[PDB]
């Protein structure tokens, strides 16, 4: 059954509508998600 939510996965046009170390994961999803953009090299001056 597309256009409906078989389980929880309701399919819109392009978006998907689903539903439902602790503080470490919550902080890495709150602030430190794309904070590791300029953290790749760590002075790797190759």
């Amino acid at each position: 059954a597309p256009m409906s939510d078989v389980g929880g996965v309701l399919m819109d046009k392009d978006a998907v509508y689903i539903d439902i170390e602790r503080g470490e994961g919550e902080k890495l999803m709150t602030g430190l998600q794309s904070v590791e953009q300029s953290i790749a090299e760590k002075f790797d001056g190759v």
Partner: protein
């Protein structure tokens, strides 16, 4: 209900649009219940898709049981309790109770080498061997998702190492850290919470690609051109893959159908279905080919070839371990071992498997030689192909389950399957100055395995060195050379003082099979209830059973390898070994100099290897004592395993010399049962054992000569009469076979022998007849060498008679 992210569905969309695999790494506890959603997204991105799913785990499932009658009666008694209604299933229960899941342990990953899956669920992260990684991400196909679940210790390592360079704090493992950094580098991989949020540390930006295959259309065009008989039927049955594989099958068919002899050897990677092309060409060869064919695979390892043979036969016209017997209905084929079918090679066609080079030269002589060269040595086999046989050997490397994949690129980069044989030196004559210098530096393996770009390029050079034409090692051996406690390395590459650059002249991996350090590491690892890191000590601790070797620490060579240029490369390896003996005797940067002047308290230094001739010559330039071997035929090459161990320490010379003496005493008797190898190499081994005894002993293990009454009891008086009959008459077997055992024993005991007389003593020790051993070795003057052997026997009999009697 909540919209998830603009990137995680779009990644699956463009992954199935470009037919590329993709990697999800999920953290958190409630992570099993989001594989329903990712499998639904993977199917609805493109219905025309494989449905099966792997659940590789190591010891125990997460929250379920994988037995549907068991969980069915469990949910039946849950109904009978009444905490849950009848027609109710949460999506994880529905996912495991409706989908097609194949369950494997992490140990038996070799059981699923052939089949194909749409999804792979790696359950545990902390133990992930790279051979298992290479076996699962290869079988995941182009619309595929490989998901990896995590643990709180890995979350601590993630929060640590996601800042710049820090690690986790207690054998420490860096392969999983190199894994985390590679997934941070990958564009087709990202890390997701248990709540379907995003950690953008691994491939942050991802756009939805635009809505829409020329090599596939060229494949269809050339396939239809070949279509417009039974040759086209075989071509369409084979070409389930790239036009490279189709062109290879067509060219092998053209060069091996009616031309009866060519030597065609198709070389390819782990993909592309080389065995599939062989088994799909088998039916065409049975049609337009001889009545007998000869396969040379491993025994009971011909799954894809036999499956494609039966599949193509059923396509065209058909109907102690396993069954590999020959069948026909309107043909013969046998998957045999090494060439015991020399007189049974009436088959005009033989197809061999990938690399035993001398056994390959023995088997491939008088028929059409098809050969499958899997990459998974090759240069030397191509040289032996060009050194003899209209060789039309050609094949290509386009993938089968993809056209090209960043997941395959990251897997090859992390598991280090990529190689490069470029020079990149200062000079070869200036590397000969390094061969005069014998200068070596340590590896600093933590900073080496920390994935940085130039460090990874030099580490790929080091891996190409450490597995360059080696003795068939593997990715689990790379993980042992990375993440073991008893390990070190040495890169004696450059002598020059130029700018940033260099090479790898010789890698050499040590293994501290110790007493103190190994006892410390083993008492540590007994809390983790595992551990096996003492091979060279434990072989002699049962064979020779010495408390001295129980108390002395030891370094053991895991591997050591140099370039494949010339004999100067063996000179470079000898200089590296001599520099290592000098090194034993006399974040972080990815080298060491002061630690190259540092070591441990080690007594013995040994290398364990197979009994090879050049390895024996290297062991003699090494001159490390040729200690106790084992003549059990290790079925890879059939080579006997010898562990030559020097003692380079304060006071161990009497122990090592007595061990060499016991090995020498055992070898002359053990050359009768299961050591019938050579004459010159046997003399070299006896000379190496006596050289070890002479170098180690001063006058301690100095044996007395053959005593009078004991020598009278060892022979007979009439046996010595027959010896005199050989001295003044013929040396026939009525007096030269009953006494020859004691003759060869006393000759190898203790007053000199020639080269022909030494081969005669070794020939009587090997107990072969006259026309075999001397005619194989010298191949000249058979009866004259037999008379010289009789004269040496007469001189020995005259010496023993004039000594005792």
């Amino acid at each position: 209900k909540k919209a998830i992210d603009s990137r995680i569905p779009s990644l699956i969309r463009n992954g199935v649009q470009t037919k590329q695999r993709s990697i999800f790494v999920i953290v958190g506890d409630r992570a099993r219940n989001q594989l329903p959603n990712l499998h639904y997204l993977m199917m609805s991105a493109d219905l025309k898709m494989n449905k099966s799913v792997l659940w590789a785990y190591k010891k125990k499932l997460l929250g379920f049981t994988s037995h549907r009658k068991k969980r069915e009666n469990k949910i039946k008694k849950e109904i009978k309790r009444g905490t849950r209604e009848v027609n109710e299933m949460d999506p994880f229960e529905s996912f495991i109770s409706n989908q097609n899941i194949r369950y494997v342990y992490y140990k038996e990953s070799e059981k699923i080498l052939g089949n194909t899956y749409g999804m792979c669920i790696l359950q545990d992260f902390e133990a992930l061997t790279p051979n298992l990684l290479a076996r699962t991400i290869e079988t995941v196909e182009g619309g595929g998702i490989v998901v990896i679940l995590l643990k709180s210790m890995s979350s601590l390592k993630q929060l640590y190492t996601m800042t710049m360079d820090v690690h986790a704090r207690y054998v420490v493992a860096r392969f999983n850290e190199r894994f985390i950094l590679s997934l941070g580098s990958n564009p087709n991989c990202l890390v997701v919470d248990d709540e379907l949020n995003v950690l953008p540390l691994s491939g942050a930006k991802n756009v939805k690609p635009l809505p829409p295959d020329e090599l596939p259309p060229k494949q269809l065009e050339l396939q239809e051109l070949k279509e417009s008989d039974v040759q086209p039927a075989g071509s369409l049955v084979s070409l389930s893959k790239t036009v490279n594989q189709a062109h290879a099958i067509l060219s092998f068919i053209d060069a091996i159908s009616e031309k009866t002899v060519a030597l065609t050897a198709g070389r390819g990677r782990g993909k592309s279905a080389a065995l599939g092309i062989s088994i799909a060409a088998a039916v065409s060869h049975g049609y337009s080919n001889i009545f007998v064919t000869s396969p040379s695979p491993e025994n009971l390892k011909t799954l894809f070839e036999f499956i494609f043979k039966g599949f193509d036969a059923l396509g065209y016209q058909e109907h102690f371990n396993k069954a590999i017997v020959r069948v026909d209905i309107k043909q013969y084929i046998v998957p045999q071992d090494h060439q015991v079918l020399g007189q049974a090679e009436l088959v005009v066609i033989d197809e061999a498997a990938a690399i035993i080079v001398k056994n390959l030269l023995g088997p491939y002589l008088v028929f059409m030689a098809s050969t499958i060269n899997g990459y998974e040595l090759s240069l030397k086999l191509i040289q032996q192909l060009r050194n003899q046989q209209l060789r039309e050997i050609s094949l290509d490397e386009p993938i089968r389950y993809a056209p090209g994949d960043p997941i395959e690129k990251w897997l090859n980069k992390l598991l280090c399957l990529d190689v490069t044989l470029i020079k990149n030196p200062r000079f070869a004559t200036r590397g000969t100055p390094h061969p005069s210098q014998c200068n070596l530096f340590v590896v600093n393996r933590d900073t080496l395995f920390s994935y940085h770009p130039v460090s990874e390029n030099f580490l790929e050079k080091m891996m190409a060195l450490y597995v360059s034409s080696h003795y068939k090692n593997s990715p689990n051996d790379l993980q042992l050379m990375s993440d073991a406690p008893a390990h070190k390395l040495f890169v004696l590459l450059p002598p020059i003082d130029p700018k940033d650059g260099g090479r790898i002249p010789d890698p050499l991996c040590v293994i501290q099979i110790a007493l103190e350090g190994e006892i410390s590491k083993e008492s540590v690892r007994n809390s983790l209830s595992r551990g096996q890191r003492a091979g060279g000590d434990l072989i002699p601790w049962l064979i020779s059973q010495q408390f001295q070797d129980e108390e002395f620490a030891s370094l053991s060579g895991a591997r050591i390898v140099r370039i494949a240029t010339n004999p100067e490369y063996a000179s470079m390896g000898y200089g590296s070994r001599a520099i290592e003996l000098l090194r034993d005797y006399f974040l972080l940067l990815k080298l060491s100099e002061q630690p190259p002047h540092y070591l441990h308290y080690l007594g013995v230094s040994y290398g364990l290897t197979q009994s090879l001739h050049k390895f024996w010559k290297n062991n003699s330039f090494v001159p490390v004592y040729l200690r106790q071997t084992a003549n059990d035929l290790t079925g890879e090459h059939t080579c006997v395993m010898l562990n030559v161990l020097e003692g380079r320490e304060s006071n161990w010379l009497v122990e090592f010399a007595k061990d060499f003496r016991k090995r020498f005493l055992s070898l002359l008797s053990y050359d009768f049962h299961k050591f019938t190898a050579v004459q010159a190499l046997s003399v070299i081994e006896s000379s190496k054992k006596a050289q070890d005894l002479s170098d180690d002993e001063k006058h301690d293990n100095k044996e007395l000569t053959r005593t009078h009454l004991d020598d009278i009891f060892s022979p007979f008086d009439l046996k010595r009469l027959d010896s005199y009959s050989n001295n003044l008459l013929d040396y026939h077997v009525i007096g030269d076979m009953i006494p020859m055992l004691a003759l060869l024993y006393f000759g190898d005991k203790m007053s000199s022998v020639q080269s022909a007389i030494l081969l005669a003593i070794g020939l009587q020790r090997k107990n072969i007849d006259t026309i075999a051993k001397e005619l194989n070795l010298p191949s000249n003057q058979t009866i004259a060498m037999f008379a010289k052997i009789m004269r040496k026997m007469s001189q020995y009999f005259r010496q023993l008679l004039s000594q005792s009697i």
